[PDB]
Design a protein around this ligand. Structure first.
Ligand SMILES: [Zn+2]
Ligand SMILES: [Zn+2]
Ligand SMILES: [Zn+2]
Lengths: 176, 170, 174
């Protein structure tokens, strides 16, 4: 179906979690409560784990992976996502770390080692370089991304609103 | 199966429409005649509707959605939507070619007879003048299209129409 | 399980120890050499022309592979090649031991020579030739510098790792 194993590892699911039947979730993947996985999304936590916080939405066509533990990269790079996170359509997340209340614009690519602090907004089609740290409360855009400006109080609030909205849209589908 | 409902909203399909079994069409999605939806495509018309004109092709990997809660998705006729194209709450005229891998954001407006180079990013609320070539991330007006090119736009739609009628048969 | 689809009279040619995720779509004249690994939600369409993928080459999750439209040109990928996540390949040619950075787009007629590295999210324009032994980055790509010996070695290690990971999935299945 949608949940697949890798070695002895199997996805750990929370409450009210949605995972479209057209998506694929493999290995050590943890989905906290109210997480919604939309259509044609792939989350492969095989060579390392993928942890996703509560009320976080992974939108249509997104792709999530990690990097294996190697010689110069003994720790490898697992994928960690906080709560109230909005991951846009066709986003590419790879071995990075995302705090809480963050919005990753559709079409963006976040590479290994990148760290996105809380209350951050990333413009669509952006590219976040490896080991790039995004300072909290700002808006970044571009390929490679550049810090554009602080977020308005409205925009910060929008981060929470965005997540909630998706939690709701998620529930409407579970209700069908 | 391939057509999913969003409460009381269900896709409306015209004549000779092609939808791959691997693609997902949800909610108020309106497909005119000869529209061809290709492999692994997702079209979501929940919070708002999605309307796609006649003889339009949505190639492999595209993702079509509307403006989150504020703007429906409208695509004209003879429109060629390249592979892995991202269209979000925008408005596309007739005889338009959206280069594969492009991203068109909320409120963007593409007039008729326009060509968008592959891998482009059309920012939010941006309008593209008819008869021009736009390329880049964010796109820039490159130059005007020759009559020959403006013609090639219609021929692309035509070719893909035959292309989808072929999959429908053999 | 129905990943293999035909197109007219053309049908996929599969080699040895080849993996194709059940969520992926392979259509028409697609030829997969030994140890090739087709990952989740990938689409490979060899209808108006064929697709040839050399041995030990990996096509990562969400990639889109197609050939040139009539107006063609087949898609040819060498051996020990590493095609990154969500990469778009279209009527181009890739030599042996090449790593295509995730999110990149390679257009019609592009020719990538052996031992090459393309940065993530790059765009290779039509008929563009990528010279052997270099790193290319950007949209559109620019020749940055020669790959070091370690980097070249890295190309082989990458293909090797994906061949193993592929077999682990083949193991869990069978
Ligand atoms: Zn990866
Ligand atoms: Zn959307
Ligand atoms: Zn194509």
């Amino acid at each position: 179906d949608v949940l697949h194993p890798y070695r002895d590892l199997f996805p750990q699911i929370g409450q009210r979690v949605m995972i479209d039947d057209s998506s694929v979730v493999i290995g050590d993947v943890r989905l906290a409560d109210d997480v919604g996985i939309w259509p044609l999304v792939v989350i492969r936590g095989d060579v390392h784990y993928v942890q996703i916080g509560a009320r976080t939405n992974i939108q249509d066509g997104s792709m999530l992976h990690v990097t294996h533990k190697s010689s110069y990269n003994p720790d490898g790079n697992p994928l960690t996502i906080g709560e109230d996170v909005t991951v846009g359509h066709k986003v590419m997340l790879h071995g990075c770390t995302i705090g809480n209340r963050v919005l990753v614009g559709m079409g963006s690519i976040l590479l290994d080692g990148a760290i996105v602090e809380d209350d951050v907004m990333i413009g669509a089609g952006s590219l976040v370089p490896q080991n790039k740290r995004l300072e909290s409360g700002y808006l970044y855009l571009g390929s490679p991304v550049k810090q554009i400006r602080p977020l308005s109080d409205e925009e910060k609030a929008g981060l929470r609103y965005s997540a909630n909205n998706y939690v709701k849209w998620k529930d409407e589908y579970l209700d069908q």
